[PDB]
Design an enzyme around this catalytic site. Structure first.
Site, PDB file in Angstrom:
ATOM      1  N   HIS A  22      14.649   7.190 104.094  1.00  0.00           N
ATOM      2  CA  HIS A  22      13.503   6.388 104.488  1.00  0.00           C
ATOM      3  C   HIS A  22      13.133   5.357 103.422  1.00  0.00           C
ATOM      4  O   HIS A  22      12.931   4.181 103.724  1.00  0.00           O
ATOM      5  CB  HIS A  22      12.316   7.290 104.728  1.00  0.00           C
ATOM      6  CG  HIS A  22      11.128   6.575 105.289  1.00  0.00           C
ATOM      7  ND1 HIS A  22       9.912   6.524 104.644  1.00  0.00           N
ATOM      8  CD2 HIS A  22      10.955   5.940 106.473  1.00  0.00           C
ATOM      9  CE1 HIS A  22       9.031   5.911 105.423  1.00  0.00           C
ATOM     10  NE2 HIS A  22       9.637   5.550 106.536  1.00  0.00           N
ATOM     11  N   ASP A  77      10.537   4.065 110.204  1.00  0.00           N
ATOM     12  CA  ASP A  77       9.548   5.136 110.351  1.00  0.00           C
ATOM     13  C   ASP A  77       9.916   6.120 111.420  1.00  0.00           C
ATOM     14  O   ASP A  77       9.750   7.343 111.259  1.00  0.00           O
ATOM     15  CB  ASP A  77       8.184   4.542 110.624  1.00  0.00           C
ATOM     16  CG  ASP A  77       7.625   3.842 109.407  1.00  0.00           C
ATOM     17  OD1 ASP A  77       8.207   4.007 108.289  1.00  0.00           O
ATOM     18  OD2 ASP A  77       6.618   3.131 109.576  1.00  0.00           O
TER      19      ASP A  77
HETATM   20  C1  LIG Z   1       3.875   4.697  99.961  1.00  0.00           C
HETATM   21  C2  LIG Z   1       4.659   5.755 100.716  1.00  0.00           C
HETATM   22  C3  LIG Z   1       4.060   7.151 101.131  1.00  0.00           C
HETATM   23  C4  LIG Z   1       2.638   7.594 100.822  1.00  0.00           C
HETATM   24  C5  LIG Z   1       4.938   8.109 101.839  1.00  0.00           C
HETATM   25  C6  LIG Z   1       6.326   7.825 102.292  1.00  0.00           C
HETATM   26  C7  LIG Z   1       6.941   6.448 101.879  1.00  0.00           C
HETATM   27  C8  LIG Z   1       8.368   6.049 102.237  1.00  0.00           C
HETATM   28  C9  LIG Z   1       6.118   5.438 101.100  1.00  0.00           C
HETATM   29  O1  LIG Z   1       6.683   4.231 100.754  1.00  0.00           O
HETATM   30  C10 LIG Z   1       7.102   9.008 103.152  1.00  0.00           C
HETATM   31  C11 LIG Z   1       6.312  10.460 103.551  1.00  0.00           C
HETATM   32  C12 LIG Z   1       4.789  10.499 103.025  1.00  0.00           C
HETATM   33  C13 LIG Z   1       3.743  11.313 102.374  1.00  0.00           C
HETATM   34  C14 LIG Z   1       4.439  11.286 104.396  1.00  0.00           C
HETATM   35  C15 LIG Z   1       2.945  11.313 104.937  1.00  0.00           C
HETATM   36  C16 LIG Z   1       2.724  10.321 106.086  1.00  0.00           C
HETATM   37  C17 LIG Z   1       1.376   9.510 106.045  1.00  0.00           C
HETATM   38  C18 LIG Z   1       1.658   8.120 106.398  1.00  0.00           C
HETATM   39  C19 LIG Z   1       0.411  10.144 106.989  1.00  0.00           C
HETATM   40  C20 LIG Z   1      -0.974   9.685 107.442  1.00  0.00           C
HETATM   41  C21 LIG Z   1      -1.065  10.360 108.905  1.00  0.00           C
HETATM   42  C22 LIG Z   1      -2.018   9.831 109.990  1.00  0.00           C
HETATM   43  C23 LIG Z   1      -1.733   8.337 110.035  1.00  0.00           C
HETATM   44  C24 LIG Z   1      -1.731  10.447 111.473  1.00  0.00           C
HETATM   45  C25 LIG Z   1      -2.872  11.293 112.226  1.00  0.00           C
HETATM   46  C26 LIG Z   1      -2.822  11.592 113.785  1.00  0.00           C
HETATM   47  C27 LIG Z   1      -3.997  12.448 114.550  1.00  0.00           C
HETATM   48  C28 LIG Z   1      -3.751  12.639 116.049  1.00  0.00           C
HETATM   49  C29 LIG Z   1      -4.158  13.850 114.097  1.00  0.00           C
HETATM   50  O2  LIG Z   1       4.341   9.028 102.920  1.00  0.00           O
END
Ligand SMILES: Cc1c(C)c2c(c(C)c1O)CC[C@](C)(CCC[C@@H](C)CCC[C@@H](C)CCCC(C)C)O2
Ligand SMILES: Cc1c(C)c2c(c(C)c1O)CC[C@](C)(CCC[C@@H](C)CCC[C@@H](C)CCCC(C)C)O2
Lengths: 121, 121
Positions: free
Chosen positions: A47, A89
């Site tokens: 990713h 994503d």
């Molecule tokens: C900067 C950055 C972050 C912070 C990171 C990743 C990558 C590639 C990045 O470049 C991969 C995984 C992880 C921690 C995973 C977590 C995913 C977050 C985006 C989640 C926020 C979730 C909310 C919206 C959804 C809620 C839905 C309701 C129905 C409950 O996120």
């Protein structure tokens, strides 16, 4: 943006994204990349590398549209970067789900010092 | 960068920063701000507003220097933006420690998409 990514992850995996993937292994949530500890972690590595490939948009900030059709994430963008971003994503959400079978909680909050250097993207 | 921010939180609170504060309430974590859930969350809110004022540096990835002197976070001169960034991080770490008493694990992994819109900084 992270909002769409988090929703996709929930949609595919059924798991709270921050809880299961906010800090998992050497690549999920943590800053930067590291040699993946397992498949789930490799999904995050792939990713980040996918994000590295984008040009024209901010992966963290730019919103994009997508839908849930026949229980499939369907990106809804034509702009090359937002489309690719959405696809990055979508791929990681699917991948995380596909590897829940070997998901291991011991990698939650994995300590960085234990991470080896990532092969470059 | 997140490394320094995390280390400061660990230093001031004694808690694993990712686990306790990587995703807490509407403001600690990814996804901007939202109406704070409690004091702990309020710290993160102020912290995000603090970052908004930064010009010339990346709060997420730019590393900086600080020292632990007499058990106090002492920001290195670095440069203007980095020093302000360090002060933003030091403040949130202090604030989280001061409010540890009301930390509520129920807000850990709070679903960001269940936060009211935050007022502008
Ligand atoms: C900067 C950055 C972050 C912070 C990171 C990743 C990558 C590639 C990045 O470049 C991969 C995984 C992880 C921690 C995973 C977590 C995913 C977050 C985006 C989640 C926020 C979730 C909310 C919206 C959804 C809620 C839905 C309701 C129905 C409950 O996120
Ligand atoms: C994309 C993004 C993320 C992911 C994010 C924030 C913001 C503004 C973002 O735009 C703010 C806060 C936090 C909630 C960060 C909180 C914790 C991290 C900084 C963890 C740091 C790691 C610690 C164990 C290190 C301990 C020191 C060692 C020497 C032992 O996560």
């Amino acid at each position: 943006s992270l909002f769409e990514l988090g929703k996709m992850i929930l949609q595919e995996t059924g798991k709270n994204p921050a809880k299961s993937y906010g800090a998992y292994g050497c690549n999920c949530g943590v800053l930067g990349r590291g040699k993946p500890k397992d498949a789930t972690d490799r999904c995050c590595y792939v990713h980040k590398c996918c994000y590295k490939k984008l040009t024209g948009c901010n992966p963290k900030k730019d919103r994009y549209s997508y839908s849930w059709k026949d229980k499939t994430i369907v990106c809804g963008e034509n702009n090359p970067c937002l489309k690719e971003l959405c696809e990055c994503d979508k791929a990681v959400a699917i991948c995380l789900r596909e590897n829940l079978g070997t998901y291991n909680k011991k990698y939650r909050y994995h300590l960085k010092p234990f991470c080896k250097k990532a092969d470059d993207c």
